[PDB]
Amino acid sequence: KLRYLNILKEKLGREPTFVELQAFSVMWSEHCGYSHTKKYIRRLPKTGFEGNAGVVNLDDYYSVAFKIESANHPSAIEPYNGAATGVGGIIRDVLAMGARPTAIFDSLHMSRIIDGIIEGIADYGNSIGVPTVGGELRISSLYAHNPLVNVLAAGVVRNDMLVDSKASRPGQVIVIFGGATGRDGIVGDPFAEKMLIEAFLEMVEEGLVEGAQDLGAGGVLSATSELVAKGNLGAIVHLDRVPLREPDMEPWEILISESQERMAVVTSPQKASRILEIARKHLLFGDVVAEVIEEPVYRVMYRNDLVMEVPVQLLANAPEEDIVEYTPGKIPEFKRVEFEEVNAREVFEQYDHMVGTDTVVPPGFGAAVMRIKRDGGYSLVTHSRADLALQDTYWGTLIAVLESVRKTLSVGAEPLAITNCVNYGDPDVDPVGLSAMMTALKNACEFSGVPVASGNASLYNTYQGKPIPPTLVVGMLGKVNPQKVAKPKPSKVFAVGWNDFELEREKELWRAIRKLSEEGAFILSSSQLLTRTHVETFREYGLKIEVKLPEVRPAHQMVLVFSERTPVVDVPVKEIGTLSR
Numbered sequence: 001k002l003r004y005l006n007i008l009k010e011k012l013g014r015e016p017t018f019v020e021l022q023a024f025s026v027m028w029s030e031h032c033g034y035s036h037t038k039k040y041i042r043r044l045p046k047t048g049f050e051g052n053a054g055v056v057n058l059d060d061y062y063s064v065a066f067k068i069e070s071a072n073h074p075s076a077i078e079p080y081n082g083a084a085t086g087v088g089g090i091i092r093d094v095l096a097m098g099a100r101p102t103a104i105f106d107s108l109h110m111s112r113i114i115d116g117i118i119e120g121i122a123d124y125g126n127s128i129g130v131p132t133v134g135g136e137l138r139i140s141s142l143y144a145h146n147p148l149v150n151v152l153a154a155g156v157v158r159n160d161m162l163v164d165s166k167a168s169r170p171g172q173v174i175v176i177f178g179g180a181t182g183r184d185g186i187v188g189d190p191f192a193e194k195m196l197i198e199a200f201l202e203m204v205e206e207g208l209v210e211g212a213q214d215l216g217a218g219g220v221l222s223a224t225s226e227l228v229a230k231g232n233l234g235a236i237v238h239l240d241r242v243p244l245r246e247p248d249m250e251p252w253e254i255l256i257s258e259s260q261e262r263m264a265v266v267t268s269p270q271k272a273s274r275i276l277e278i279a280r281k282h283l284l285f286g287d288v289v290a291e292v293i294e295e296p297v298y299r300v301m302y303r304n305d306l307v308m309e310v311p312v313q314l315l316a317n318a319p320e321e322d323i324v325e326y327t328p329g330k331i332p333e334f335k336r337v338e339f340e341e342v343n344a345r346e347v348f349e350q351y352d353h354m355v356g357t358d359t360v361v362p363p364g365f366g367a368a369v370m371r372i373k374r375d376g377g378y379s380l381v382t383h384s385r386a387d388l389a390l391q392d393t394y395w396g397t398l399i400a401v402l403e404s405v406r407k408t409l410s411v412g413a414e415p416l417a418i419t420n421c422v423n424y425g426d427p428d429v430d431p432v433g434l435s436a437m438m439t440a441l442k443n444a445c446e447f448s449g450v451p452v453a454s455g456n457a458s459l460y461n462t463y464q465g466k467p468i469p470p471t472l473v474v475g476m477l478g479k480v481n482p483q484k485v486a487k488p489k490p491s492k493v494f495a496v497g498w499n500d501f502e503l504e505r506e507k508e509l510w511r512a513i514r515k516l517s518e519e520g521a522f523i524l525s526s527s528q529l530l531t532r533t534h535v536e537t538f539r540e541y542g543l544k545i546e547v548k549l550p551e552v553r554p555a556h557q558m559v560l561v562f563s564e565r566t567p568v569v570d571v572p573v574k575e576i577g578t579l580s581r
């Protein structure tokens with residue numbers, strides 16, 4: 001950032017005012033800027049139409065909108081408020097795309113089961129009326145003082161209702177509604193959030209939404225500057241029209257405040273009156289705060305006093321760190337780096353973290369499955385392998401992405417897109433690890449043919465000099481007819497695949513997984529072959545699984561199949577048990 005202020009001072013050709021100073025401290029900070037990932041990201045194969053969340057076409061009529069955000073720092077400080085707020089925000093990003101939130105998917109990484117994080121998530125999720133269809137729980141002391149909370153949200157939006165995260169023409173107005181702005185971020189509540197969801201969609205139907213963006217880091221500042229910058233336009237932000245929680249706030253406060261449950265809507269001036277009516281009706285606070293213009297300047301006004309004015313683009317774009325070319329080495333073999341294997345059934349139940357109460361199949365089997373209609377549905381998988389990543393960064397990440405495809409295929413789904421969250425340590429002290437990650441993901445996608453639809457990033461995850469295990473959490477989207485999805489029943493258990501790994505024959509395993517899934521077999525793809533959750537959920541059906549699991553370690557290419565007949569495929573197949581009663 002030091003580098004960054006003399007750059008700012010260079011561009012501004014003067015010392016920044018107190019406000020500018022504040023305004024850039026946020027827009028240019030890693031979180032909002034992505035100065036270390038912009039380049040590495042642009043490299044990744046994209047798809048759909050990403051705004052505040054990637055939107056993937058699911059059947060030419062409907063599209064699923066999803067994204068996976070992190071809440072690592074705010075969760076480290078406060079677990080409950082940390083988690084719940086992460087849930088609040090990511091859901092808004094999905095909301096801002098015109099899709100109705102339909103699932104919340106977990107990805108916790110901790111030194112122990114922090115009840116604060118699990119409840120903050122469950123509570124908020126329940127209070128907005130959005131199920132937590134699935135999740136992923138990784139336990140390790142390596143995450144002792146740096147809990148990783150990766151929350152993924154998803155929703156459905158008709159393709160003829162997709163909402164853009166940008167301003168299109170000089171003359172539109174930007175509306176800010178939802179919670180009232182107050183000195184937050186120099187405590188969110190789902191009731192409001194719920195009204196925001198029910199209120200936003202409402203407006204969307206009436207064609208009253210021509211552009212939108214959630215309010216997160218940066219408050220009124222980020223949402224307006226980015227709404228106009230994305231469309232090479234400008235804005236005349238009138239801070240006195242922002243509804244305030246605490247009325248005695250200074251311009252710079254209102255502007256940069258980070259109050260929760262707030263949205264920004266870009267629309268036609270003639271539509272605002274209605275936006276504010278649907279907004280007030282749902283007990284929210286709205287008003288026409290900003291106005292999009294042609295001169296690419298970001299002019300912030302209070303009443304008649306000029307608070308600030310800068311080249312909108314200078315704000316939108318942050319200095320870009322260079323990139324480092326990582327050249328994959330030979331694949332090394334990993335050793336049992338273990339993640340404690342902790343059982344939190346009755347904990348998830350105590351806090352109502354039901355995880356899968358309305359899916360085609362209990363998310364305890366990995367890939368969640370949601371219906372869109374009788375014969376139309378999508379799949380959600382969240383994977384990650386820091387145990388391998390720790391050891392080797394490139395190959396451990398590449399593998400998490402491959403293992404995700406399996407999970408996706410073990411439910412009968414076609415992989416469509418990937419959303420990922422980058423949980424890394426310090427990029428400056430060790431910029432190679434980061435590149436080893438991004439490259440691993442760049443390659444894995446080019447290998448599987450699955451494109452990145454959206455993503456997130458959390459860097460500088462360190463505890464007094466120590467960086468967290470390189471952790472890229474993979475969020476894959478699958479397509480799938482629910483009717484064809486396989487449900488568990490009494491059958492024999494098989495071990496299909498190799499106890500080891502080989503990048504080439506990954507696709508042969510994908511091939512076998514498909515042949516079998518389609519023949520109606522029920523498959524399981526987890527690095528441990530079988531776990532607590534699996535066993536337990538089989539009981540849900542009144543099934544007792546009895547198998548003699550071979551030994552993989554610690555990155556194999558084998559799944560478990562449960563069918564009547566023996567699997568006839570062009571890959572190792574060995575019978576190993578039952579599943580009855």
Ligand SMILES: Nc1ncnc2c1ncn2[C@@H]1O[C@H](COP(=O)(O)OP(=O)(O)O)[C@@H](O)[C@H]1O
Pocket residue numbers: 031032034037041044050051052053054069093216420421422452453454455456457
């Ligand atoms: N790791 C990533 N993979 C793919 N896209 C990413 C990644 N990190 C950031 N992005 C994209 O960069 C853009 C800005 O990200 P972000 O600031 O998180 O937007 P938002 O405030 O809506 O979360 C978005 O398109 C986001 O999806």
Ligand SMILES: [Mg+2]
Pocket residue numbers: 032222226
């Ligand atoms: Mg942003």
Ligand SMILES: [Mg+2]
Pocket residue numbers: 052093213214216
């Ligand atoms: Mg956003």
Ligand SMILES: [Mg+2]
Pocket residue numbers: 069089093214216
């Ligand atoms: Mg966001």
